[PDB]
Design a protein around this ligand. Structure first.
Ligand SMILES: O=P(O)(O)OC[C@H](O)[C@H](O)[C@H](O)COP(=O)(O)OC[C@H](O)[C@H](O)[C@H](O)COP(=O)(O)OC[C@@H](O)[C@@H](O)[C@@H](O)CO
Ligand SMILES: O=P(O)(O)OC[C@H](O)[C@H](O)[C@H](O)COP(=O)(O)OC[C@H](O)[C@H](O)[C@H](O)COP(=O)(O)OC[C@@H](O)[C@@H](O)[C@@H](O)CO
Ligand SMILES: O=P(O)(O)OC[C@H](O)[C@H](O)[C@H](O)COP(=O)(O)OC[C@H](O)[C@H](O)[C@H](O)COP(=O)(O)OC[C@@H](O)[C@@H](O)[C@@H](O)CO
Ligand SMILES: CC(=O)N[C@H]1[C@@H](OP(=O)(O)OP(=O)(O)OC[C@H]2O[C@@H](n3ccc(=O)[nH]c3=O)[C@H](O)[C@@H]2O)O[C@H](CO)[C@@H](O)[C@@H]1O
Ligand SMILES: CC(=O)N[C@H]1[C@@H](OP(=O)(O)OP(=O)(O)OC[C@H]2O[C@@H](n3ccc(=O)[nH]c3=O)[C@H](O)[C@@H]2O)O[C@H](CO)[C@@H](O)[C@@H]1O
Ligand SMILES: CC(=O)N[C@H]1[C@@H](OP(=O)(O)OP(=O)(O)OC[C@H]2O[C@@H](n3ccc(=O)[nH]c3=O)[C@H](O)[C@@H]2O)O[C@H](CO)[C@@H](O)[C@@H]1O
Ligand SMILES: [Cl-]
Ligand SMILES: [Cl-]
Ligand SMILES: [Cl-]
Ligand SMILES: [Cl-]
Ligand SMILES: [Mg+2]
Ligand SMILES: [Mg+2]
Ligand SMILES: [Mg+2]
Ligand SMILES: [Mg+2]
Lengths: 316, 317, 314
């Protein structure tokens, strides 16, 4: 039984994949103590990606899907079924690991009985930004969701204890193109207690290179996960978590500024209708735990009032 | 017939009452010319308050209520029934009078045929602040409600002509825990003409120590009713002006003025705004033009009973 | 057939009219090539205005209306029926023409086959300001409505080809006291292609519940969306959106929502504004300047509070 399975889905990556794979194979951890599982989501780049992967035959486990799934959910789920390790680490195909990522994160995790270990993120290039606040207090052995800003770092680019995933049958959902990674991390967080944060190096480097029916279905699942948490059983604690997630959603959500956008009016109405329907399944008791700058925007969404959301956005 | 009855309700004050009572007994006014009526609202402090009051038996009139009323309304009403003086002065149990408060206020009142005399307030300690604007023009023999900011000083901690109270049967109401003193002063102001302001000393020292609105807005409703039924201010346009100015004071200093963006439960906000809307919609819109224009949107939002609009209005103030 | 008929309605102008009439009679154009038609809207100023007009008997055509119409619509319509010229030029009674206004504008128009020629405006005194942006690019032989800011200069104080007015039976409407001149210019613009702008001089000097108003605004949008010149629906949306922008920037009672207007009047006004704008396709909204995105939606939603707020944020 290996310490870590690195699970990496690929799709039409080409010669860029060399850098990523190399970063995983060049770890300070004993090479026999981890594996790299590569799951190609049926690349169609005239065999360029598959040719790069073939160069590491013998040194990595590999499966190719018959049809392209469209996102990383099915590939990652396939990797999870293939792993029998203590921890898994999800890695995106364009990104890089620091030489001492698996060793340092696994050691910290093992020494603190961690269900989840989060390594400090770095970033190369303009594009997506990475979480910063979670890492501002240095290393944290027993982190807290609220006090350590974990709802602002819900990517799956972390080390997860496989037993938690297995015991609770946590899979990536495929009903949406976005926020499926958030739902996964939330499901995990709500079914575990021990989270640790390690910040000695930039362990993971992120490399930068419609009506909302499906999106808000996923957001709904996130709130459901919080309110059904067997770890956070206290209803007031659930309200606090839900409120904090609402804050993150209003700060960093998809199409956060839809109301004053160039979007067609009928589309705005349908979008807000889905956002309203979803947030109105969340107890109002959570609202008091939302950052108060968003008090008006949140009420506007609850009331399903487009004008009020437009105004709220103008005042933010 | 005495010049002044000082009416002071007490409740679980203890040894703090000595300072207050002493301030009343040590007045420059002839001691035979006034009385201190003490009405204890059934203190339950192991007889501590009653023990302090007993030390002045013979120098004060005193009645104890059988059950605690909860506020100062019933006690003050009892004091009024007991007084046969020319003027009454309401004093709170923790507060102080200046040595020359009754004398100076009574003299100014008598020399100007005043129905109401307001002495400049002082304050000791962090907490509740006191009115300032009303006293910024010095002494005023014939003051005006609007021009002298009297709607921003509606406490009953003043000298009132008893005849006005008696002739018009003015009592403190008990349907609400708050704003009952405001309603009293408003009822008095709307049934009298002569108000004087005296500022030579800090005559009254306020001492600081270290709801769905059904009843509150019923009291606010009574305030508007008092203005619009005033036999002194009979001109409808004058009533609009007074009403508008009160609306301004309510939006500036009202209870839970910032309820809309508060941590109040949504259902409570709705009920609160519903009461606020129901009440303000009984006030003619003709008064709105006399409201300070910064509040134009907030006022309309309340009239329309639109929570979102009130929230926004508050964000723009 | 004369080159130009200057059409000038008068009403209780008095001795101020001398200056105006003099400015028309003192043109560089051959005096036999134009006429000044004066239409008095039944002045009642103890014969003062009529006395000034009588001094130019022989030099002007003149008709007096039996009853005062209240605005310039009926008078101007009367002038149009009286003119058989190639172009007409509407002149207000207190205003002035530059010595070389008719000549320069007619020549430019004739040389560019212009349906409409717009001379640069000047202004004397505090009050109404005049369009500026339309004239910022100098002379334009073939102007464009959008690119040359013509919706910000919709007065009829311009030179119009009479054939376009007769062929399309364009009259000033009388349903409203205001915006009737705008409707006229819009009707003209939507039924012609060739517009020219001349800026060498200040050729024209301006001297200083909404049921009816919004009926007129409605006619403006109708004119755009029925235009036989601008037939492309997307072009109509663009024109409509640009007019909406001008309406929000310079409309009558633009700031009604936070005004001293009685509440009941505000509601009725906004109701008319909402009813009218909701007959305009939402496809035009994308062509409205985005600062007005909220105000426009507020009006569409007929929400007084939202209009008040919108105005507070502008
Ligand atoms: O006191 P509050 O909680 O109201 O305010 C919090 C502070 O203001 C705090 O300083 C900041 O929120 C912390 O922000 P940050 O500088 O640490 O960055 C965190 C951001 O959330 C981060 O840059 C991303 O927006 C979050 O991305 P991930 O959670 O890692 O997941 C990617 C996610 O966006 C992706 O799944 C979506 O594109 C698809 O739905
Ligand atoms: O906008 P305008 O020009 O019309 O007026 C605004 C001016 O700036 C105005 O002159 C100032 O507001 C006057 O303020 P101030 O400095 O004279 O006094 C401040 C307050 O009036 C005062 O501190 C209290 O807030 C008022 O309470 P009271 O009138 O003494 O009545 C007691 C009442 O609040 C009590 O019943 C409540 O606690 C129960 O709800
Ligand atoms: O926001 P965009 O990009 O679409 O353009 C905005 C620019 O800033 C634009 O240049 C300005 O809005 C307009 O420039 P301007 O300095 O030439 O503005 C001229 C005004 O439109 C003018 O002072 C009058 O408002 C319009 O005169 P007319 O419409 O020709 O007169 C008849 C009618 O408007 C009049 O009855 C109304 O003013 C009565 O309220
Ligand atoms: C840098 C970061 O925060 N990454 C997130 C970001 O990825 P990002 O926006 O960077 O997009 P990426 O190219 O990294 O794609 C994510 C991963 O999914 C794989 N892939 C992509 C397309 C496809 O059809 N099939 C497939 O398996 C890619 O090989 C890659 O490993 O948004 C994704 C979708 O919301 C998240 O799940 C990622 O964790
Ligand atoms: C500085 C100032 O503006 N003071 C006001 C403030 O008093 P404040 O907030 O200072 O409250 P206080 O304790 O002074 O109460 C007012 C008076 O009521 C008496 N009391 C209190 C409780 C009780 O159950 N029974 C009873 O009789 C107290 O003895 C006291 O003399 O709010 C009161 C209630 O609106 C007003 O009447 C006071 O004018
Ligand atoms: C500079 C400018 O754009 N002015 C416009 C403004 O006039 P403005 O506000 O400048 O008012 P004016 O004095 O120019 O009056 C407009 C003209 O209408 C005539 N008149 C006036 C009253 C009357 O009862 N009968 C009558 O015929 C006047 O003689 C005058 O020639 O509003 C009119 C109606 O929307 C427009 O046609 C004018 O172009
Ligand atoms: Cl999101
Ligand atoms: Cl007054
Ligand atoms: Cl109050
Ligand atoms: Cl207009
Ligand atoms: Mg990536
Ligand atoms: Mg007190
Ligand atoms: Mg609203
Ligand atoms: Mg004029």
């Amino acid at each position: 039984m290996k310490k870590v399975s690195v699970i990496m889905p690929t799709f039409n990556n080409g010669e860029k994949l060399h850098r990523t794979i190399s970063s995983v194979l060049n770890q300070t951890m004993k090479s026999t103590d981890y594996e790299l599982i590569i799951i190609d989501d049926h690349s169609n780049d005239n065999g360029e990606t598959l040719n790069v992967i073939k160069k590491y035959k013998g040194l990595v486990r590999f499966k190719q899907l018959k049809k392209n799934s469209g996102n990383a959910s099915v590939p990652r789920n396939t990797g999870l079924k293939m792993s029998k390790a203590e921890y898994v680490f999800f890695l995106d195909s364009d990104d890089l690991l620091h030489e001492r990522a698996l060793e340092d994160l696994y050691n910290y995790g093992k020494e603190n009985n961690s269900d989840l270990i989060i390594g400090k993120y770095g970033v190369e290039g303009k594009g997506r930004s990475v979480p910063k606040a979670i890492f501002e207090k240095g290393n944290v052995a027993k982190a807290d969701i609220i006090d350590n800003s974990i709802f602002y770092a819900l990517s799956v680019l972390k080390m997860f204890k496989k037993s938690v995933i297995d015991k609770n049958k946590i899979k990536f959902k495929t009903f949406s193109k976005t926020a499926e990674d958030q739902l996964f991390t939330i499901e995990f967080l709500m079914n575990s207690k021990n989270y640790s944060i390690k910040t000695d190096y930039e362990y993971y480097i992120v490399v930068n290179d419609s009506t909302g029916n499906q999106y808000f279905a996923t957001i709904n699942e996130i709130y459901k996960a919080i309110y059904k948490s067997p770890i956070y059983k206290n209803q007031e604690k659930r309200h606090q978590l839900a409120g904090k997630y609402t804050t993150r959603l209003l700060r960093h959500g998809q199409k956060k500024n839809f109301a004053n956008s160039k979007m067609k009016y009928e589309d705005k109405i349908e979008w807000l209708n889905n956002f309203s329907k979803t947030i109105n399944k969340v107890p109002r008791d959570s609202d008091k735990y939302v950052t108060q700058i968003f008090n008006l925007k949140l009420e506007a969404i609850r009331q399903n009032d487009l004008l009020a959301v437009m105004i709220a956005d103008k005042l933010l």
